[model samples]
Target: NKSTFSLNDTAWVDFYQLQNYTFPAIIICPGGGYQHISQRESDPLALAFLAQGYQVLLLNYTVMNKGTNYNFLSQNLEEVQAVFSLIHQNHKEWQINPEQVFLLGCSAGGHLAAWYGNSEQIHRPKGVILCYPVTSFTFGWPSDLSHFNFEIENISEYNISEKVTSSTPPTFIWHTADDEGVPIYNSLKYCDRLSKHQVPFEAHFFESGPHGVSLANRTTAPSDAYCLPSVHRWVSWASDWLERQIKNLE
Candidate 1:
């Protein structure tokens, strides 16, 4: 849903769960280059996780780029932290496994998860799932660069790959080898950071598919939005991997 142009401080979290029993959860952040939100990348993915029996909290974080560079770093992180805090606080009443809280993002949203998941704050997801993400701000935006500018060094902090520390959560990352909009190195560079720190992670490099191919299906791309049949495996690959890691904690 689009927010009002004025005082766009609002963000919503929709929780999806099955059975009253406690379960793992993920915060899905759809990517729209941070200039707008993506309908294709939102609800359908929510239903996907719902079928897996994992509670989901989909956040429509405030995004207003274009003429409003506004430096979204602080505000976006604030929104994400608030969501994680809310999920953590309500875990018991919500029947969610506190330790299995995770974050999932596509494109810019992936960069969101990548950056925020590095938080040393008490509230943080146990793992992060990145799908064809933009893990760095050093290079450029995925599609059409935001044309927004910040201080030279400040931009590096948002690179996220360099922000990786021991506090960064275990992660799952995947990107198409031929992603023109974002480049393959975005995921590769971040995974390299994870490896250097001895952090546990799993990464996949698909041979094909372009950028922003949400779900690799029609829901995320009812027409010609880079739909690839084999790319659908990423969902299960991430789901199964998280099942083992998250369910392992269970």
Candidate 2:
């Protein structure tokens, strides 16, 4: 069902939550050039995670309707932290293992996912799933510059590569080499950082296919242009890795 919660402004933000008594929980952030939540990307993706026995929190952050500005970024971060804090604060009601909370995002959302993964206030997620994420707003490739000033401030504080240390949670990343929008270098650079830090990470670079090709839209000819066997392979790998980590923690 849908719920609304206040972040800062008088009106509350709209979000959808699905409950599963005995399952992990994931918060999904949809990409939309920081303009709107991509329904094409968010809804189906949440459904898929639900199918995996996860209680999903689908967030539609302040975007076009709220106006893209520094205020928007601040509000977005607040919303994310609020949602995560709510889940952890009431883990029993959600049946969520606070340690097993996961974050998933695509494109702009992927960027936010990575940002939150390194947040000091919120507990790092069990894992991060970034589908064609935009890693560096300051670097090459065309990006939505509306919020660049604010983004640069945060990017400088938390360098993606430097932050991927042993303490960083495991991550699953995927990007197509031919994506002309965000560019593959973002993922490659982040993976390189993870590698240098000896941080555990898994990345897949499909040859073709445009950006934002989640399973729901993997049917068109362009989507089939790449030889992606299916992201499920990476998902299974992540699940196994998470299980091992849980065992180690025990």
Candidate 3:
């Protein structure tokens, strides 16, 4: 069954859980360059994790129109924290395994997932999954980020890679070498931080593929170009990694 809970009038989370089962949970933030939420990265992507027996929370965090001065750190971060707070307060009622909770996102949403995982004020996830994430504001693709309202002096404050610490949760990341939209550099940069902190992580860099390939298959693919079998393997890889991590905690 699915339950909808609002953090505010505009932002909310759709919670999905299998009846009578207490399973590991994951909150997914679909990416849209901090503009609108991407339909390509929303429900279809959630279904894959759902099939793997994990309770799913699909977040519709706030995003502004392109060129608008949106304060992603202040506003979007607050909305995500609210969703996490809701789960922390209702894990038992939702029939989720509080200890095995995870966070996932695509593109800009990946940045949010990564940022939240490193947040010191909230309960961190057991693990984080990032797909072609935008890890830095200083460099890489999405070359123009005027949509985010952070001032030049403090723009790097939101760079997820720079914020990593030893306590940051284990992470699973994947990116395509040929991803023109967000660039492989973003994932690599994040991995570098994880490495420096000695945090456990797994990263996969596909030889070639386009960006925004949600599931890399028909379920979320909008065109033939996105239907790469190799790239699609990331779903199973990430799912299995989370499963193993959950077991490791036992």
Which ranges of candidate 1 are over 4 A from the true structure?
1-8, 65-69, 140-146, 150-153
- After the best TM-score superposition of candidate 3, give how far the Cα of residue 227 lies from its true spot, in angstroms: 1.1
lDDT string, candidate 1, 29-85, tens digits: 898777777777888888888778788888888776344556766788888788768
Which residue segments of model 3 deviate by more than 4 Å? 65-70, 145-152
Top lDDT prediction, candidate number = 3
lDDT of 2 by residue, 129-178 (tens): 88888776654533545633444445554335554666667788888777
The candidate that wins on TM-score is 3
Inter-residue clash pairs, candidate 1: none
lDDT of 3 by residue, 61-85 (tens): 8777434454655677777777668
- Model 1 residue 211 distance off true place after TM-score fit, in angstroms: 1.2
**Ranking of candidates on TM-score, top first:** 3, 1, 2
- Write down the TM-score for model 2: 0.79
Pairwise TM-score winner, candidates 2 and 3: 3
Model 3, TM vs. native: 0.93
lDDT (C-alpha, whole model) for all candidates = 0.78, 0.67, 0.83
